[PDB]
Write a protein that binds this ligand. Sequence first.
Ligand SMILES: [Zn+2]
Ligand SMILES: [Zn+2]
Ligand SMILES: [Zn+2]
Ligand SMILES: [Zn+2]
Lengths: 157, 138, 73, 171, 141
Amino acid sequence: AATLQLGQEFQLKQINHQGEEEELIALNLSEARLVIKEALVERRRAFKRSQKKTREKELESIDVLLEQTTGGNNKDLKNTMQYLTNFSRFRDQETVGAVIQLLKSTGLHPFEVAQLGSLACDTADEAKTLIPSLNNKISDDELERILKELSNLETLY
Amino acid sequence: ENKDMCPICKTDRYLSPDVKFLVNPECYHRICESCVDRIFSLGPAQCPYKGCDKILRKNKFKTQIFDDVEVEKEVDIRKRVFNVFNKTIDDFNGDLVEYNKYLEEVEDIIYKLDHGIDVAKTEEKLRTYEELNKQLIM
Amino acid sequence: YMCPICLTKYTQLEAVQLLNFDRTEFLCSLCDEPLVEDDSGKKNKEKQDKLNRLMDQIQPIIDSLKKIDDSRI
Amino acid sequence: MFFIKDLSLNITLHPSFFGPRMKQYLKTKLLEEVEGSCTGKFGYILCVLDYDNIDIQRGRILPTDGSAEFNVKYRAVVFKPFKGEVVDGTVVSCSQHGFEVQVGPMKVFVTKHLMPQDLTFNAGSNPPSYQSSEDVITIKSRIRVKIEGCISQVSSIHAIGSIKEDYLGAI
Amino acid sequence: PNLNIVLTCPECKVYPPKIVERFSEGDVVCALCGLVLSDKLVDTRSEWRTFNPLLDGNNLSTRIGKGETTDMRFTKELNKAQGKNVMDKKDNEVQAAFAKITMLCDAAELPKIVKDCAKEAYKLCHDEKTLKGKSMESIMA
Ligand SMILES: [Zn+2]
Ligand SMILES: [Zn+2]
Ligand SMILES: [Zn+2]
Ligand SMILES: [Zn+2]
């Protein structure tokens, strides 16, 4: 539920594959946009490694490129992406990493800031409307100062 | 009265008559809170006050608590007329006959409004209010 | 909702889980046979009249009771 | 929602695939049945990272079918929905009981009993779409959607949202 | 919904079921095509070899008694009580007429067959306002 009650496989307290703890890992669909294309680009040059022995057109040009590097049955993925670019308004990766620098220097729940990273909010109650869970944990002026930062941080392409 | 206070609760004087029996300025009717609220909440539907079909409006009701509705109409009519004819000359220079006669004319529409004889002069009174309202705007 | 064939009750949500992209209407899990809506607010109206009827019956009773309540006799 | 995660898998090798490039087939079998598939316990496995450091640690032979098997401890990404959070989406399909938001890989259909009262259906629209006091919930419309019921069965999810609260609607 | 199973060949689908039954090894085989369909065919015969519902119909009860590890009190309570749950059924007037004709068909030696029919018809009507009593005897006659 919205009430920051995600399952046990989605608690904060989760283990690495090498048996060791970590805060949960949760992105906005804009940063989570970025890692896939680069990571699947790892696969594709690597697919072509062992084989050695404005934006949206950039977007789908790759979503064919990783398509043909993948098996093809995954048109749904390039749905997920095509959903993103419409609803993923972040670019210029460091900003997003620095956006998080701001969003994490709070000690907020990543689910929230990632959800904050997922949303084109403007103001306090809006943010608290869209996410109830950001209604009271903090003082909204922080949320507010962030939002105008966030609202003009918006990289419009 | 004690036998007609609502379509639902017509006998309400000894049923704790603390809930409000509103006249919609267009109902002139005894509507217990249950029905009047039920109505303006859904909206301007009729208060089913004893076969009534007149629209108990949305939240535009006024307060009239059992004031002899012949008076409630006579009171509701006079104020709007005395507001439509608000100060049409009554103290322009200090006259007592004409102002009082204009006053004697003022509530004569209200007495006609509280009566509505064969209504064709009450309509003429309404045109005077539009003329009075038109004069008020200028 | 319900099903009117195997007569098991249904709803919006459990069944929209069961909607299929090739279908407009919710089939049944059990009989594989589409559903129907179910409820009726009529009973609330039926209950509204009963409270209306009971208050009419109880007014002279609560007239006398309060009238008795003056001296607690 | 989008989270990133560690998942273990127990995969089985029928023995004819004991050519030494099994590992690639392990890396094959892993990839070609993890991407784009689904769980009910973590949702949509969208994609997989760290293909070069793949845990293929150890393996065992089952007393029947003789088939060796392994536990491949691997990190990927997961689409995992919950209830109550707003999320945008562009609709794709309209029917009578509401409309079908293409949310990422999911198509959340919202109910007319989840639409508020201002917005109704004009079937006379083409593409059939919803005309409100202020804006139109078309198919291509980007809508701000909160989740209400998000039914996740193992290998199968479907979800329900409504705009009936504020800063919602067509965007 | 009828909750049924129609048995059918998946590799023929040719026809209503034209198969054969391999009891003695427990399978049904697609007589035409040669494929088994089902397996572990349970005994359907040795089942009964061990051991009045046309009359009594659906109700269940039992004949019971005293034990070796018992005293006459528990003998007596299950003598009186197993008379206390017979009024739940008019079937005392159902059972007893049986017991009546049971006694009687015996007394004049009648075979098993006469009795059962003469039982069976007694289930058939057993009553009507038309019959309305009628002595409870001339009917049994
Ligand atoms: Zn009333
Ligand atoms: Zn009225
Ligand atoms: Zn059914
Ligand atoms: Zn066959």
